[PDB]
């Protein structure tokens, strides 16, 4: 491992290199400026980002001794010998040379003093404080500490003079992902038909290790087709398939469609794939949505040239059965950004604090796998008015809303977190969410027009065998006040009548055989629509339509 | 045990077998490709699916060293002894030969390290992290883990290098259950009458061990039929198909064992009148579950929900009982106000749990009696309990229509006040057909009278046409 | 007994279960009776402690894991089964749940006859009428 | 006493009850008196916390289980029996629930006569009339 292994964060790499070499390579400039260089440095960030790799690389280029201390391996069996073990390790590290010391998993020895309730841990942490303090200027030894989460650190360890400089090893950008891909793919037999730029342009939230997972998965897939064709039979080995081996692009596509970022698998969503042709109608609305979602994620230079802060939230409102959840599905599957699905009441919990912890965790993952699109469906469940009634049942709902506002208002151009809102009753939405600067643009989804409705019918009956001589414009003109859900219901009833006809025809055929084509016609007939129209209704009453119209007017 | 024991999951058998054997049979090929194979895998799914069975099969077939770690076994009382045990285990596995570690019930030893408040557990998980990755992480060894709640693991442990590949050993399909039955009936002696295909079709939610239990119960029934010891009876047992029918009619899937309904005995002939509604219900329930090829031929998902509404006692709960008793799909009978709780969020937690059971043991039918009790209008109540009812109805809306899979859940609602239902529930997609159940007419009243008098002796000359003509506004209850 | 197995030291309750099962398997084809099991088998999802969850996982792996059990049968008794981990309510661990419910008139007569067979009754007492007039008695 | 058996550590209250009952059964036929049983016998399923459920189950096992008791008698005292676990209010655990309620005029007269046996009175003192005016005074 070397300087060419760690990748992405070039400026951070330069900063850490300066920090670790200069007080060990050239201390004359430190004396000239007049500052004593620090002895401890922290690096933090999401797990699997490259912290340990960078520390090992630093231990490699510099010939200074590298003493790794596994966090959970510092205790001992006999009463009070772990302290002696740590002390003798540290004294050998100092006495031997101006070495480099790496303490892994500091969190194991930093439980914030509140959830400790022990005494051996207290003794070990205090011993570490004394050993860290007892570092003379002549030692010329510096410690690098590795923490998975930054907020579980003892501030006593964070005080100046012991551990002062932290570095947020964050998510590499597109160039960082491309270069790390090159680093991993340079030691492989790569076929010519490869474009790593596309892979480093379609991968968004991946950080450090999942790229390696991607590579391994692709290699495995290649092994799959070459094993299926070779058919070694598990009784010998040949010597021609190995040299006739080339990694394709379709395997990379398969790996991309298979794996997801290592952080978001805890919230993996079941694969439902809906194309932009599934959302019939709403052409201008879909165009506006595309413009709103593609610009912040692809044109930062345009954003700078405009000089206007883009909105970082949006609210869909309208009558039930119009397609809000459908647009959410379409964005989730083919928007080219991460997506975490959450249900409103799902997060709330009966214990004290757990609810706010859940909001904090979901938004932490959202910021980690940036860019992302957090879909809040049925927003009126968690975001209601505040102080509506004296009986606030402990004010937990108010506390949750305050947590959502305080932890969502800490946004900026960075982290690219786009919030999709979706509510059925906008009247109960809190005005705090609706104030300008937080969720400004509002999209009202109206009832479909006759043309839009014909498009909806064609989009719902796309993958359905249908008669040659049949039209849908009559149905569209007839179902004047219908909604998308109603159109789904009518087509479903027609299909149900068709399957009934098919099964009765098959039963009659079997009977006459007892005493080839499966049905008299595999396609849905016009008569099925004709006699499936007697049972449809209209989803939303005129009162609900009037209320939504008034809300749009105001 | 071998590869002929684990049944119903071809993909998972192939994935685990290749991952465990191919890097330990042709390492040169993986040096030729250049990269190392995945080396840690976590098997997850509902209990009684075959995770431990797969581990046993791998241990028996592969000739390499195998070390087994039950979860709590590592911990000990003396300070810093659990980590010593883990280090000793890893060293023993590595030193002798290339080996396979198997950690059963990892949830006991790998908490989230964020909600826990102990000390020893957090050091044991940190020690596991260091052993799985770091300086001198691991050589020529593979790690398999088994769990029932993959979400109860700290995410830092489930990254590449520790557990890169996730195999999902879930509920089987009809073909999977048929294959499992064929495996489990390979050693007993069966009569010719048994037909496993129909039995697998009717086993709508059984997973793994459930099938084994069914077989055992059938055999026991056969044992207690020909025991009312000489070799004459020791030979010629002959597990009949009737034994299997009885055991299937007695057992229920373990998933729904929590919410097993009391055995009420009604039949379709008990429901007088409403012939067309009865046929409609038959058509809407039995077609998606028995004839999926035609639905996929047309490329449309089936209709699921239905709502009965009408005057009290017209026969709504009677239809629900008939569905519960004379339908192959599983039944979840749920009360209206039973699911509410005094705590904060426990109503929606219970609703989510109920629907999780329904979607787990699919195809399933859930009966919502008095839908107007929990699903009322939204925001009408001024003085409320913090909008708990509002959150309940929103939870129902998202659970019945959201980011779900829409595999097979049939919701039937029964309320006599259809004006108090939230209009967001009445739209197609959740409760898409509303069936009015009107008061019986004369030909329905006569049918009802015969329906309830089919087990009663009557005078031969007693004609019921006069009674039917005499009751005009009456209902079935009357 | 239900709560009798757990001790304050970390990692000793599971050791007690290990010892119990190992003795049962080492001695003979045995029967293990666990009384009031609801106290050592919660759902691991509503509980928040650590020793209880770990004990539950120990029980699951000890009754059904690799080389699970050899000719030893497990009996359990509880007053409420719904507060038990679903992973324990499965074939292999708890094969079948018997419902010992409220006796009917004949059951009450049998209970009365067995319980009044060692005392010196008078000649004027019949037990069928007494079993008829006693209605909701659980035995 | 109620809170005197509980301890901080997990799995020690039950040890306290075990040793207490063992001491009771070690030597002679013994009488146990648990004052304020409602403080350590809550209604199961109505409480949040495994320790209360465990101590309730341990008490149930101790009083009525396999080889339950030998010539040992148990007495409890509570103010609100309705808050006691119903499994505890069965024959074999708490079979005779005696109601020590408000005395009547005669009982309160007895109370006055016993209380004024060590006190020095005046010649012109009667307790029957004094007992008559008091109505609700208990003990």
């Amino acid at each position: 491992v070397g300087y060419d292994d760690i990748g992405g964060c070039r400026k951070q790499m330069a900063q850490i290199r300066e920090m670790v070499e200069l007080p060990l390579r050239h201390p004359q400039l430190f004396k000239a400026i007049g500052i004593k260089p620090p002895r401890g440095v922290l690096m933090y960030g999401p797990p699997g980002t490259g912290k340990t790799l960078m520390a090992r690389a630093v231990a490699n280029e510099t010939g200074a001794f590298f003493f790794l201390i596994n966090g959970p391996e510092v205790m001992s069996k006999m009463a009070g010998e772990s302290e002696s073990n740590l002390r003798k390790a540290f004294e050998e590290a100092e006495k031997n040379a101006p070495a480099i010391i790496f303490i892994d998993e500091i969190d194991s020895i930093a439980p914030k003093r509140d959830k400790t309730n022990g005494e051996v841990e207290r003794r070990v942490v205090s011993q570490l404080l004394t050993l860290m303090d007892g570092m003379k200027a002549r030692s010329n030894v510096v410690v690098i500490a590795a923490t998975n989460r930054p907020n579980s650190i003892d501030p006593a360890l964070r005080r100046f003079g012991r551990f002062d400089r932290e570095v947020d090893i964050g998510i590499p950008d597109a160039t960082g992902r491309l270069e790390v891909l090159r680093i991993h793919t340079k030691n492989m037999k790569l076929a010519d038909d490869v474009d790593l730029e596309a892979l480093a342009a379609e991968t968004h939230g991946y950080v450090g290790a999942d790229i390696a997972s991607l590579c391994s998965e692709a290699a495995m897939q290649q092994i799959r087709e070459k094993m299926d064709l070779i058919d070694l039979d598990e009784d010998e080995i040949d010597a021609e398939v190995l040299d006739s081996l080339g990694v394709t692009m379709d395997n990379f596509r398969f790996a991309l469609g298979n794996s997801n970022p290592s952080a978001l698998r805890e919230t993996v969503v079941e694969s439902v794939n809906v194309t932009w042709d599934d959302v019939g109608g709403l052409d201008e609305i879909k165009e506006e949505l595309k413009e709103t979602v593609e610009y912040p994620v692809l044109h930062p230079d345009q954003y700078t040239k405009f000089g206007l802060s883009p909105s970082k939230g949006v609210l869909f409102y309208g009558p039930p059965g119009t397609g809000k959840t459908l647009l959410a599905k379409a964005v989730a599957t083919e928007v080219s950004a991460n997506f975490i699905s959450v249900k409103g009441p799902e997060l709330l919990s009966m214990w004290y604090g757990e609810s706010e912890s859940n909001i904090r965790d979901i938004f932490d993952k959202a910021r980690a796998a940036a860019p992302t699109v957090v879909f809040l469906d049925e927003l009126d469940s968690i975001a209601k008015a505040r102080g509506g009634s004296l009986g606030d049942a402990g004010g937990a709902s108010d506390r949750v809303v305050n947590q959502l506002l305080t932890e969502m208002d800490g946004m900026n151009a960075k982290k690219n977190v786009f919030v999709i809102g979706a509510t059925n009753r906008p009247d109960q939405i809190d005005p705090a969410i609706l104030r300008p600067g937080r969720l400004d643009q509002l999209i009202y989804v109206p009832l479909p027009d006759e043309n839009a409705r014909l498009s909806i019918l064609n989009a719902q009956l796309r993958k359905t065998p249908l008669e040659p001589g049949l039209e849908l414009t009559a149905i569209a003109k007839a179902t004047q006040g219908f909604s998308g859900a109603d159109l789904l219901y009518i087509v479903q009833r027609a299909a149900k009548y068709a399957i009934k006809d098919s099964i009765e025809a098959h039963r009659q055929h079997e009977a006459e055989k007892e005493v080839p084509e499966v049905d008299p016609v595999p396609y849905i007939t016009k008569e099925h629509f004709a006699e499936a129209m007697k049972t449809a209704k209209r989803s939303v009453s005129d009162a609900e339509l009037r209320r939504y119209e008034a809300y749009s007017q105001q | 045990v071998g590869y002929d024991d684990i049944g119903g999951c071809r993909k998972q058998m192939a994935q685990i077998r290749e991952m465990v054997e191919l890097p330990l049979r042709h390492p040169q090929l993986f040096k030729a490709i250049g990269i190392k194979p995945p080396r840690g895998v976590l098997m997850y799914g509902p209990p009684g699916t075959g995770k431990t069975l797969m581990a046993r099969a791998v241990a028996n077939e592969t000739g390499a060293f195998f070390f087994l770690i039950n979860g709590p076994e590592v911990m000990s009382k003396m300070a810093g002894e659990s980590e010593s045990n883990l280090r000793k285990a890893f060293e023993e596995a590595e030193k002798n030969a290339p080996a396979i570690i198997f950690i059963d019930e990892i949830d006991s030893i790998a908490p989230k390290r964020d909600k826990t408040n102990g000390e020893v557990e957090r050091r044991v998980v940190s020690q596991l992290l260091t052993l799985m990755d770091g300086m001198k992480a691991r050589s020529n060894v593979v790690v398999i883990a088994a769990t029932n709640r993959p979400n109860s693991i700290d995410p830092a442990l489930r990254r590449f290098g520790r557990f890169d590949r996730e195999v999902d050993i879930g509920i089987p399909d009809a073909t999977g259950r048929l294959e499992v039955l064929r495996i489990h009936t390979k050693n007993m002696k069966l009569a010719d009458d048994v037909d496993l295909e129909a039995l697998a079709a009717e086993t709508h939610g059984y997973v793994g061990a459930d099938i084994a239990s069914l077989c055992s119960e059938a055999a026991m029934q056969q044992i207690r039929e020909k025991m009312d010891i000489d070799a004459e009876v020791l030979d010629s047992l002959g597990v009949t198909m009737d034994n299997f029918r009885f055991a299937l009619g007695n057992s229920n899937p373990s998933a729904l064992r929590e919410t097993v309904v009391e055995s009420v005995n009604v039949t379709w002939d008990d429901v007088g009148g409403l012939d067309e509604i009865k046929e409609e219900l038959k058509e809407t329930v039995e077609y998606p579950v028995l004839h999926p090829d035609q639905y996929t031929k047309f490329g449309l998902s089936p209709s699921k929900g239905v709502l009965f509404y009408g005057p009290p006692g017209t026969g709504k709960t009677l239809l629900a009982k008939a569905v519960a008793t004379e339908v192959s799909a599983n039944f979840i009978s749920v009360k209206g106000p039973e699911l509410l709780s005094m705590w904060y969020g426990e109503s929606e937690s219970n609703i989510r749990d109920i629907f999780d059971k329904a979607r787990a043991a699919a195809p399933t039918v859930v009966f919502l009696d008095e839908l107007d009790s929990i699903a009322k209008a939204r925001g009408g109540s001024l003085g409320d309990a913090g909008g708990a009812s509002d959150r309940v109805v929103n939870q129902l809306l998202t659970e019945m229509d959201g980011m779900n899979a829409k595999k097979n859940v049939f919701v039937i609602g029964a309320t006599n006040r259809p004006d108090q239902i939230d209009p967001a529930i009445l739209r197609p997609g959740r409760l898409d057909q509303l069936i009015y159940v009107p008061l019986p007419d004369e030909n329905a009243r006569l049918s009802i009278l015969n329906a309830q008098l089919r087990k009663t002796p009557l005078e031969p000359g007693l004609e019921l046409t006069a009674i039917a003509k005499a009751t005009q506004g009456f209902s079935g209850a009357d | 007994n239900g709560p009798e197995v757990m001790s304050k030291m970390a990692g000793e309750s599971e050791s007690n279960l290990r010892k119990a099962f190992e003795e049962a398997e080492k001695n003979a084809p045995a029967i293990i009776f666990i009384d009031e099991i609801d106290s050592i088998a919660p759902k691991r999802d509503k509980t928040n402690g650590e020793v209880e969850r770990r004990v539950v996982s120990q029980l699951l792996t000890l009754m059904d894991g690799m080389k699970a059990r050899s000719n030893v049968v497990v009996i359990a008794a509880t007053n409420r089964p719904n507060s038990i981990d679903p992973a324990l309510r499965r074939f292999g661990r708890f094969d079948r749940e018997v419902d010992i419910g409220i006796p009917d008139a004949t059951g009450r007569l049998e209970v009365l006859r067995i319980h009044t067979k060692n005392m010196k009754l008078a000649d004027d007492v019949d037990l069928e009428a007494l079993a008829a007039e006693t209605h909701g008695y659980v035995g | 006493n109620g809170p005197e058996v509980m301890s901080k550590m997990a799995g020690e209250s039950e040890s306290n009850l075990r040793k207490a009952f063992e001491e009771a059964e070690k030597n002679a036929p013994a009488i146990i008196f648990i004052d304020e049983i409602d403080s350590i016998a809550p209604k199961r399923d109505k409480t949040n916390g495994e320790v209360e459920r465990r101590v309730v189950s341990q008490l149930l096992t101790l009083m009525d289980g396999m080889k339950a008791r030998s010539n040992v008698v148990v007495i409890a005292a509570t103010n609100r029996p309705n808050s006691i676990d119903p499994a505890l209010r069965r024959f074999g655990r708490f079979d005779r629930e005696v109601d020590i309620g408000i005395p009547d005029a005669t009982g309160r007269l007895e109370v006055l006569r016993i209380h004024t046996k060590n006190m020095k009175l005046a010649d012109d003192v009667d307790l029957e009339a004094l007992a008559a005016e008091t109505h609700g005074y208990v003990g």
């Binding site: 069996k77 051996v120 009986g391 049942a393 | 003396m78 000390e119 003085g383 309990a385 | 209880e52 | 550590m9």
Partner: peptide, 23 residues
């Protein structure tokens, strides 16, 4: 020699109440 010890203390929940209005 030293030894460890386990401890599980308690938890605290939140309830929900219903109120009555007078129009």
């Amino acid at each position: 020699a030293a030894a460890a010890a386990a401890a599980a203390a308690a938890a605290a929940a939140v309830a929900v109440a219903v109120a009555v209005a007078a129009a």
